[PDB]
Design a protein around this nucleic acid. Structure first.
Length: 17
RNA sequence: GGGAUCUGUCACCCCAUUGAUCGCCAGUGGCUGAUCUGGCUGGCUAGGCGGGUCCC
């Protein structure tokens, strides 16, 4: 029906770790 | 071999596409599926692997 996430269109951000 | 730190690599969450590009649909809303940037002053005693350093 509806996704749990509010938007969930961008993620991944830890290249520098 | 273990622990800590850094880097690289592999995933997740939130916000911005009235930030840019591609694809589908449509008169402008939705979809991250890919890449980049900003917020790590955000969550790594939240995870795995490799290398360097230090310690044992």
């Amino acid at each position: 029906g509806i996704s749990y996430g509010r938007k969930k269109r961008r993620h991944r951000r830890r290249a520098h770790q």
